[PDB]
Design a binder for this molecule. Structure first.
Ligand SMILES: *[B]([O])([O])C1=[C][C]=[C]C(C2=[C]C3=[C][C]=NC([N])=C3[C]=[C]2)=[C]1
Lengths: 9, 243
């Protein structure tokens, strides 16, 4: 599924 | 930790255990080849060769199926760390890669934690989880065997600095969390532990915001734990994590 992003949404 | 309960096996993928000589500390996987800990853990400057890092552990010093053991190739203490004030209380561990060029081998039990946004303003309302294998009460005889975690609210610097809390002891780069009422806290043996706090602006809603640094007495009244403020050090972490 790939990584879940660590970014501000 | 005091006032907490045993954490679920899949509950703490990020947490790392650090062993050397007679010593122990915890830390957080913030990238596959990098652990963030407290500098005061490595105050005595042991040799990387003597350091053993174990990822994916649930029971302190217990072998397990998801567990992964790793050597440490080097580590960096923050250049301005003080063993007296504990200001700037953080350190980076560079994990040793294997022949395939991998360090941590990610899985559901072993995964990095997101770094903090930093720009967003800190709030008292924000809630955090603190975790560790240290003393479950003050005067405790041994370290916990199963990882404990407990929920604690963030505490504003202006209220932690206030003279009824910790006063002049709270410096730039530090942060506090816990109930002024007491009861829930990290304790001795919890050094280098990750404080993970709600971040409404983050996609995972959860980021590493503190490193377990110091306090006064396991869970005492009016005395929250003091943590290294990870967001304060983003630039330092980015800069020495290219490395
Ligand atoms: B460590 O495992 O290196 C460590 C040694 C001594 C003390 C602590 C410690 C104690 C403490 C008491 C009450 N509140 C807090 N937040 C702490 C943090 C760390 C750790």
């Amino acid at each position: 599924n790939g990584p879940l992003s660590c970014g501000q949404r | 930790v005091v006032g907490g309960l045993v954490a679920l096996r899949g509950a703490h993928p990020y947490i790392a255990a650090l062993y050397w000589g007679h010593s122990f500390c915890a830390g957080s996987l913030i990238a596959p080849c990098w652990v963030l800990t407290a500098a005061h853990c490595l105050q005595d400057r042991p040799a990387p060769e003597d350091l053993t890092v174990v990822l994916g552990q649930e029971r302190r010093n217990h072998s397990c199926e998801p567990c992964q053991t790793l050597a440490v190739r080097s580590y960096r203490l923050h250049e301005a760390f003080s063993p007296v004030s504990y200001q700037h209380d953080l350190a980076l561990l560079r994990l040793q890669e294997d022949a395939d060029g991998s360090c941590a081998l990610l899985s559901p039990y072993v995964q990095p934690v997101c770094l903090p946004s930093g720009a967003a303003r800190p709030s008292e309302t924000t809630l955090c989880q603190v975790a560790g294998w240290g003393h479950q009460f003050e005067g405790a005889e041994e370290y916990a065997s199963f990882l404990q975690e407990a929920q604690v609210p963030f505490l504003s610097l202006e209220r932690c600095s206030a003279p009824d809390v910790h006063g002049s002891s709270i410096l730039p780069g530090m942060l506090c969390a816990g109930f002024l009422e007491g009861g829930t806290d990290a304790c001795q043996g919890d050094s280098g532990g990750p404080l993970v706090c709600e971040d409404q602006a983050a996609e995972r809603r959860l980021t590493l915001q503190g490193i377990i640094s110091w306090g006064s007495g396991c869970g005492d009244r009016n005395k929250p734990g003091v943590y290294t403020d990870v967001a304060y050090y983003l630039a330092w972490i980015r800069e020495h994590t290219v490395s």
